[PDB]
Write a protein that binds this ligand. Structure first.
Ligand code: NAG
Lengths: 50, 50
């Protein structure tokens, strides 16, 4: 939900730690153009521990 | 005198080393993303985890 995003040559880098990773809030946004997942399944992200 | 009973010691050491190699090959990921079946089944879908 950030208002201003960074360019592709200077992409931002946020670190997620010490929090409950509830990926259900991601689906609340607009329909995605590409939701490809590599090495993980998009359905079982809420049960994994990273 | 040392190495007097080396014949039986060699046999038992070969057996122990074969067992250690067999148990160490379990942790070797042969091209897979992980060496644990639980880390693959609980992370990937069946058609991709197979
Ligand atoms: C995203 O940000 C806009 C602007 O603040 C807001 O109106 C909208 O509700 C936000 N969307 C979500 C899912 O929070």
């Amino acid at each position: 939900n950030a208002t201003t995003f960074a360019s592709v040559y200077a992409w931002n880098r946020k670190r997620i730690s010490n929090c409950v990773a509830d990926y259900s809030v991601i689906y609340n946004f607009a329909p995605f153009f590409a939701f490809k997942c590599y090495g993980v399944s998009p359905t079982k992200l809420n049960d994994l521990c990273f | 005198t040392p190495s007097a009973l080396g014949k039986l010691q060699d046999v038992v050491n070969h057996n122990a080393q074969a067992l250690n190699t067999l148990v160490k090959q379990l942790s070797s990921k042969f091209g897979a993303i992980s060496s644990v079946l639980n880390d693959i089944l609980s992370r990937l879908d069946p058609p991709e985890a197979e």
